[PDB]
Amino acid sequence: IPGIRAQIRFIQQVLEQREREDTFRLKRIKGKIEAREAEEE
Amino acid sequence: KKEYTGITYISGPLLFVENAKDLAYGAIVDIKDGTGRVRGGQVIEVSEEYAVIQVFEETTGLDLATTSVSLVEDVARLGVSKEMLGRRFNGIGKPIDGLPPITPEKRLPITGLPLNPVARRKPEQFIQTGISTIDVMNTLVRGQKLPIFSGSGLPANEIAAQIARQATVRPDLSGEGEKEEPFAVVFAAMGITQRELSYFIQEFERTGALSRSVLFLNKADDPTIERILTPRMALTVAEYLAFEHDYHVLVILTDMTNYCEALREIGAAREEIPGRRGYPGYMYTDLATIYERAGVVEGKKGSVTQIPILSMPDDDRTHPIPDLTGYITEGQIQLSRELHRKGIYPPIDPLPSLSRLMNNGVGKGKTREDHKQVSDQLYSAYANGVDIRKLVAIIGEDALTENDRRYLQFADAFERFFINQGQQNRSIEESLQIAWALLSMLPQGELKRISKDHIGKYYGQKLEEIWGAP
Amino acid sequence: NEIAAQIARQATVRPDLSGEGEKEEPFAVVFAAMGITQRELSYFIQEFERTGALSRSVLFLNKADDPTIERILTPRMALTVAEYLAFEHDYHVLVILTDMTNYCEALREIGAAREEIPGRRGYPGYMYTDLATIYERAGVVEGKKGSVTQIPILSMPDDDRTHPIPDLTGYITEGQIQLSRELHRKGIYPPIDPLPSLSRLMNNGVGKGKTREDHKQVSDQLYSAYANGVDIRKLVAIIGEDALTENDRRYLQFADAFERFFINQGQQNRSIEESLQIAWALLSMLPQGELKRISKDHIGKYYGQKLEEIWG
Amino acid sequence: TEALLARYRERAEAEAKAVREKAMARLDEAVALVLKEVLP
Amino acid sequence: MIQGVIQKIAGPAVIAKGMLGARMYDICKVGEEGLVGEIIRLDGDTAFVQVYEDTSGLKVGEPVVSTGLPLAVELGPGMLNGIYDGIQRPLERIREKTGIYITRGVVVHALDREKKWAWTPMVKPGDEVRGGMVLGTVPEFGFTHKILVPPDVRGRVKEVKPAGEYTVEEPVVVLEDGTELKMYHTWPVRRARPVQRKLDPNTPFLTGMRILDVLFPVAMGGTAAIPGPFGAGKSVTQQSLAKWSNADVVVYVGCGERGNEMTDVLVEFPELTDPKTGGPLMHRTVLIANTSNMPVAAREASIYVGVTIAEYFRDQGFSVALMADSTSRWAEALREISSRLEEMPAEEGYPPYLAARLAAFYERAGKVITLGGEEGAVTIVGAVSPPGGDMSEPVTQSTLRIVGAFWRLDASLAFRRHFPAINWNGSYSLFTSALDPWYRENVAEDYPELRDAISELLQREAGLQEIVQLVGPDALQDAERLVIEVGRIIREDFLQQNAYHEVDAYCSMKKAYGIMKMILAFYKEAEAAIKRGVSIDEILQLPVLERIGRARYVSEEEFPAYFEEAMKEIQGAFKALA
Amino acid sequence: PVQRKLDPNTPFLTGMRILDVLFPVAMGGTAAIPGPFGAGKSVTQQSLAKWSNADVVVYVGCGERGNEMTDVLVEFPELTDPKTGGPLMHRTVLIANTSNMPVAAREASIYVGVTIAEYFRDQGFSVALMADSTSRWAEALREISSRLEEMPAEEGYPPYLAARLAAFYERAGKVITLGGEEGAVTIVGAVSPPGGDMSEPVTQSTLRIVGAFWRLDASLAFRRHFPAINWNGSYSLFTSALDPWYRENVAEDYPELRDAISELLQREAGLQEIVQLVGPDALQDAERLVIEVGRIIREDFLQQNAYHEVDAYCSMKKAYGIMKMILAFYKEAEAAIKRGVSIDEILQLPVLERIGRARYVSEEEFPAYFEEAMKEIQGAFKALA
Amino acid sequence: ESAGELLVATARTQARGEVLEEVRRRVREALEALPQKPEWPEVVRKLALEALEALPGAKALVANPEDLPHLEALARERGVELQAEPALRLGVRAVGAEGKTQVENSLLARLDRAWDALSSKVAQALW
C-alpha cells in the first residue's frame, strides 16, 4: 500500500508539473498575440 | 432594418465588423452573404473600433466584399406559452415537429435571475419514479437536484426515458390532498446522435408521454452555442410553468459531459486561459447557475425538480465534472458496469448511491411509516451479503455458518428481484411489499434496524407474492 | 552499437532456400552519425576496418563537438546517396543512423527558437511529418533490382517507451527491436527482449519456399510459452516456488532455458536452420499436448530431439 | 375499435371545417388590423 | 465624483475611458442601470472595472461613475435580527420590493433609514473625544447599542442633541471642526479595526459540550476548525454552540452553501429559543447568506464582511462567536477569481496567496482591550469540507497550520448513535496548558490531573483494540476487561450528551469535574477489588453504575447533593463487596 | 442530402467472431478501434475490407505507411469477392495520402472518401468506409493551427476538433435516398493515441459519438494473442436492436447463448481479482471450473488467425455452434463436479482438444464435426455416471 | 383512447396554421397593392423620414427612381443626397456618412419583424 501510494503521488506531481508548463506556454503566446495586435495593428 | 457592411477580418468562428458600436454585448445577429443565405451569430465583444461576432455553424461562403450583418435581438429571449406541451424544439426554440409555431404569452430572457434565499422553503414531498431502487432507498424529493452517474457503455438513455414515462405524484398518500395537481416533464438533450434522437422520439410518442412533455433536442453536429443555450431554455420554460401555473415540473438533462465539452470549446475559441485540467475557471459558477434554478418557493404551489445525467469520462469520480456536480447537487445515483454485464436492468448500485434529502420526504403522512427503517435494513443486509459472497469464493460454502448462507441467498434474491425489475412500473407499495418479502428470508431478530411493531405488522410474507408475476 | 555492427557484419540473403538466382552480392553500407562521441565512432571505424567493409561504405560523420544545427541535414544527405545508389546502380544498400535522439533535440531547438506550438514535452508539432520524411525513403521499387534497408538506432531517455521520440518512431516504422536492461544485467548478449519487439513484414518473407514450412507456427508457440513463463515468474514472487504445480514448474524452467540458450548466443553467426533446431529443442521440454499453435504434422516431424545433442 | 377512430376522424374534420368558416368570418378585420399596425 | 464612459465590453470586464483620478479598488457604477464593480487596473486615462452581475445588454458609451470608496460595510443600529447577502444587502427588503427573484441593479440600504431610535446622550459640549469613545446609547432588543465615534475621528464636542427619537441619519454630535457624527459609520472590510492591546488566552470559551469544554477546549479569542462529513450532525453542534455558548452575539456566515442547506439554516434559526431570556435566538444573531449561483465577488467578500461586523460588536465591548461554514467554498470562489485574472496557479490550482488570505482572516480573532478601554473578544470556528474527506487539500493544510484547535467530527460514531460524533483520537487542542491556571482558580485545583487521567484511560482502551479485534472480548482477563468496561462507561456517561434533552443539553465545568471524579473513584475501587480477588461480573452489577449513568440528567442546581450521595455510595457499595 | 433516416436493424457481418458476436455493429452504425502501435488496427481493417458483406468498400489511408497501400494493391486483385464472385478489387476504392505526402491533404482525403461513400449510398448500395487513422487528421489540423498562430486547447489541438469529428461521423446511417431507394454507410475509424493514453482528447471525443467501441490491448498483443480485444473495455450499443435478426437468421436461442457467454466472462474477470491475490490453487473447484472455462473461451473462441486459410473467416452459424459446444461442456463439467468428480481429472478429457481445434474446420465440413463433438461431449460425461 | 383526441388536436393546430398563413398572404397582397394607389407617397416619405432619424449621421438617401422625386423635398430639407437603386420597393434605404452602415425601411421588413408580436393578438381577433 505505501509503495503504490507513493507512486500515485509521484504521477500526480508529474502531471501537475506538465499542466503548469502548458499554462505558462499559453500565457506567453497570448501575451505575444495581444502585444502584436496592440502595437502593430 | 439597419445593416453593417464593414467586415474586416474572418477567421475560424469569428469575424470583426467595423462601426458597430450600436450592437449591445451578447446580442444576437444575422449574417447574410452574396448568395442570400443567412447564418446566426452572437456578439462576444464590443469596442469603439470594431465588434467581435462568434458565428454559428460554418463560414464557408463568406467574403469581405458582400457580407452584411443585421441585428435580431439585444438579449436572447424565448417565447413561452402553455401550448408548448406536446411540442419538440431544436435547442434554440425552433420547432422541429412540423407543426405551426406557437404564439407566445410573453418573451423571457433565457438566462435566469437567482432565486432569493429567503423566498425558498424546505422540500417535503416525494416523486414516485416507478423504480424500486430509487423510490425506496434513494427517494427523490420535490425540489431536489439528484444527478445520475453513468459510464460509456451503460444504458442511461433507457433509464431517462423510463423515468420520464413513469414519474408521477401521489397526492392520496399525503393525507387527503387534491386529486388534481398538474405534472409536466421538460426533457433537454445535448449533443445526442441521430440514433438516440430517434429512440427518444419513438419512446415519447409510443406511450402518450408526449402530451405532458416539452422536448428540447440538440444534435451532435449542431453548433456548440446551441448546446450552451439548450439547458437554459429548458429551465426557463420549466420555471415559467411551475411558478406561473402551479405545475410540478421535472427536468431531465441528458448529458452534461457534452455541455462541459462545448463550454470548454467556446472558452478556448475566445482566447481564455483554461483552469484545472483544461476546463474553464468559471465552470463551477456556470454549473451552479444551471443547477440552482430548481426548488420550491414559499407561497407558491409549483415546484421544479432536476435530474442531471452525465457520463463519467473514464469511470473516474475525481474528474472535474463529477466532482463539481457533487458540490452543488444533493446526492447521486450511480450505475454499475458489473450489474449491466450480468444482465440486470436497470443497473443501479445501491451501495455507492445516496440521496441527501430523503429523510424529509418519507415517513408518516407520506409513503409509509416503515420506509426509513426498511431502507436501512436493506442496505446493511446487502452489504453483508456481498462481503460473504466475496469470502465464500475462498473458504467455501460448508465453512460458513447458517446466517452467512442465508445472507448470501438474500443478496442473490435481492439482485434478481429488487434491482432487476425490467421495464416494469412499480408503485411504492409494490416496492415496499417486495422489500418486506425479501427481508422475510432473514430470520426475525436479525433485523436490528426495524422496530418491533413494523416487523409484527409486515414480516411473514412469502416471495411468491412477486415471484408469481415479477 | 555492437548489435548494429554485428548485423552489418553477418547480414546475408539465402538464395538457395528461396530458389532465386543464386548470387552473392555484398551489401553497401551508408553510415550517418548525429552527435556521436569519440568512443563510439572509434569503435565503429575499427569494426569496419576489421571486417574490410570500408571500401563499400559511405560515411557522414557529425560528432558531438560539431554544431548542432548541422544534424538537420545529415540524414537527408545520407538517404539521398542511398536512394541514388540503390535505384540507379542496382545496389542493395543498408543504412544505419546512429541516434535519432540527437536529431530530435536539434529539431526541438529550432522549433523552440521559432515559437512553435509544442507537442508532448516541448517537441514541435510537425515532428511526426519531419520523421516520416526520413524513415519513409526506404523500400523496393517495381522493375528495379536495388533496395534500401534502414536500421535506425535511438536511445529511449529513461527506458520509457511512451516518450514522444520512440512513440512516433514506432508509429512510423515497420517494427522495432527493443533491448532489455534486465537481460543486460544478467550477462545475456544480445539483450533483445522478444515480447516488446515486433516485425510487421515478417509474414512476407517466411513460410514454405522461403525459409521453411514450420517457421511461423514455431514463432507463435515460442511467444505464447515465453509469456506463460513470465506470468508464472510473476506469480512465484508472491506465492513462493514450493507452492507451484508441476505444469507451472515446467513453464518456469522453459523460460529460464530460453533466456539462457536462445537469446544468449554471444558473437557467433547462427544460420536459420540452427536457430530452428534450437527452438525445437527448447519446445520439446513442454508436453506434446501443450503445443496448440503448431499443426500435428510439424510436431510429428520435428518434436522429440533433446537440447544435449547440440551442447553437452 | 376502427369505428370509434372513424368517428373521431369525422368529428375532427367537421370541427376543422367549422373553425375554418369561423376564421373566414373575421379574415377582413384581421387583415385590416395587421395593415393598420404595420403602417407607420 | 469621477465620471466616465464605457469604451470596451467583454464579459464582466469593462474598460472605461476618461476616468483620470479614479483610485484602485474603488467601487464604481457601470451603465445606465448602475451595476456595481471594482477597479482592478489603471492605465493612462482609462480604468479596468470588473462588474459583479452580468453585463449582457450594455452598450459602448454608457456612463461610468466612481464612488471613490472601496468595499465597505455600514456599522450601526439595526444589524441584529437581520439577514444579509455577501456584500451586506438586506434580503428581506429586496424580497418585499422585487419579488422572489433578485433583479440586477437593485438599490437598498443595509441599515433602515426610517426606523426611530431612542437616543440617550453621554457627552456634553466642550468635551474632547477620541476614536473609539462612547457618544450615546440606544436600546436594540435586549442590548444597549453604544454609538462609537469612528476610529479616525478626533476633536471637541460642539453640540449634542437631547434625548428623543431619531433615525440613523440625524447628526447627534457635531465637532468644532464642523464634522458631523451620526449613529452609524462605514468601514472597509479588508482593513482590520484598531485596538489598544491584544491579551493572552487566559480565559476559556464555554461551549456547553463536555467533550469540547474538557478534552479539547478553545480559549476565548481562539480559533478552531471542524470537518463537514455528511450525516455527522454538524448543524446540530453548530446551533448548540449558538444557543449555549457564553458569547453575547453570534455571527453566522454561509459563503457558498447549497440552496436547500441555506433554506434549512434560514428556516431553523427563527424557531430556536434563547435560553438566557426565553425569547427568539434571532434577536442576538446576524446571518450572512450566499448560495452557489450568487455573484462570485459576494461569495469572496462574505467572510470579510462577517469578521468586520464581529470586530465592530467586539469594539462595543461584547464577546462574539463567529461561525464560518464551508470555507472550502470560499477558497473555490477565490480560485475562480484568480483564474479570471490569469494568474499562475500553485499546487491544486489555488492562487499562491491562499495561505496569506486564510491567515489574514483567522488572525483577526483574539481578546483585546478596545479603544474605549473595555474588554471584548472574537472567537472563530471555521468549517472545512475537503473534496472527499482528504486532509491533504491545500485549504485544510493551510488551515490546520494556524488554528489553535481541531475537532475532527466523525460519521462512524454517528452511525453508532454516539453524539456528539467527535473522534477523540484525531482531535487536538493547543489551549490546555495556557488555560490551566484558570481551571485551578475557578473549578478545582485538581482538575488538570483528573482530565489527564481520563485521557489516559481512553488511550489505554484504544490500545487494546487489536487484541479485541483478533480475539473475542470475553476471552480477555480481568485487568483488561476492567479497563475496557470503564472506557465504555466513560463513553456512555461522560462523552455523550443529548442536545434535545431539557437538562442534558447544557453542562457546566463543575458538573464535568464531578462526573470525572465519580468515574475515577469507581475505577480505583474496582481495581483495588480486582487485586483483592473478586470476580469482574460481581463488579458489573453494582448499584453505583446506574448512579453514575444518571448523573447526566440531573438538574444543575441539584447536582452537588447527587454528586456527594454517589461519592458516599462509592465507598458504601465497595466495602460491602469483598 | 437524403429523404429520411432509418433505424438500424441489420448487422454488419465483419467475419470476426468476437466483433460479430460480443460487440455487433449495425448496417448504418459507427464504430471506433483505438490502440497503441503494434496492436492490430490495420490488420483488422483489412480483414473487414476482405470479408465483410458490404456491396462497396471505400478505404482511406490517411497519413499511414505506403507499404500497406502497396500490399492492398498487390493482393486484392488476386482475391475473390465473397458475394459477387469476381475480383475483390472490383468493389474497392482506395484513397491514399501517406506519411511523407503533403500534410494539408490529410484533411481533404477524409472528406473525399466520405463523399464518394455517400454517392455510392445514393445509388442504393450498402457501403463500408474504413478510415485508417483520424489521429493523423487531428495532427494535421494542429500543425495548420500552429501556422495560423491560434489559441490551442488541450494538447495543442484546435478548439473545433470535436465539431469536425462529429460532423464527419454523423454522415453514416441507413437512409431513404432522394430517388426512393435504400442505402447505408458504415464508418469504422481507427485511432492512434500518443503513447496508448486513452485519456487523449481525440479518443475521448470519439467515445461520445460512436455506437460501438473496440479497444485493443497492448498486453494481449505482446503475447501474440489476436485480435487482441480488451473485453473489459469494449462495448456495443447495437446489441438490442439486432436481436430479431439473430432470432430469424441464426437461431432462436442465440441471444441467450451470447448472454451466458458474457456472464461467464464477467464471473471469470471477478474471480481473477482473488486469483491475483492468493493464486488459483486457493479457490474451490467451482471457481477453478469457471477459470478454466474462461481460459477455454479466450483461447478457442475469441482467438482468430487472420492469416490462416480457414480461420480467417467465420460465419455466424460456426460461432453459434462453438458457443453451444462450450456451454454444453460447462454444464456437464459443473454437474460432474457437483457429485464429487475432481476437476484436476476433467482437464485431461480428450474432447478438450477437439473443442479447441474446432476453429480450423472448414465451413462446409463443420456441421458434421459439430454433431460428432456434441455426441462426444454427451458420451464423455455419460460414460462416467 | 387518447389517440383520437390527439388527431383532433393536431387537426385543430393545422387548421389554425392554415388560417394564419392565409391571413399573411392576404396581408402581403394588400401591402403590395399600395404602390398602385395614390396613398404610397405619404407612407414612403414617412418611412424615409424615420430612416433618416434612425441614422443621425446619415449621408445619402437611396431608393428606386420612382420615389426620388417625392423624396426631393426631404433631400432639400434634411440636406442629404439622392441616388437611384433597383432596391426593394415599399421602403427607402439610407447610407451613413462613413459608408459602412446602412439602414433599410422596407414595408415587408416591418411586416416580417412585427408578425411575431402581431400573431398572438390576431389569434384573439380570429377567435
Ligand SMILES: Nc1ncnc2c1ncn2[C@@H]1O[C@H](COP(=O)(O)OP(=O)(O)OP(=O)(O)O)[C@@H](O)[C@H]1O
Ligand atoms: N448532539 C446531538 N444530540 C442529539 N442528537 C444528535 C446530536 N447530533 C446529531 N444528532 C442526531 O443525529 C442526526 C445527525 O444526522 P443528520 O444528517 O441529520 O445531521 P445534520 O445535523 O443535518 O448534519 P450534517 O449536515 O453533517 O449531515 C441529527 O439529525 C439528530 O437526529
Ligand SMILES: Nc1ncnc2c1ncn2[C@@H]1O[C@H](COP(=O)(O)OP(=O)(O)O)[C@@H](O)[C@H]1O
Ligand atoms: N488477427 C491477427 N492475426 C495475426 N496477426 C495479427 C492479427 N492482428 C494483428 N496481427 C499482427 O500485429 C501486427 C501489428 O500490425 P497492425 O495490425 O498494422 O497494427 P497497428 O496498425 O495497430 O499498428 C501485424 O504485423 C500482425 O503481425
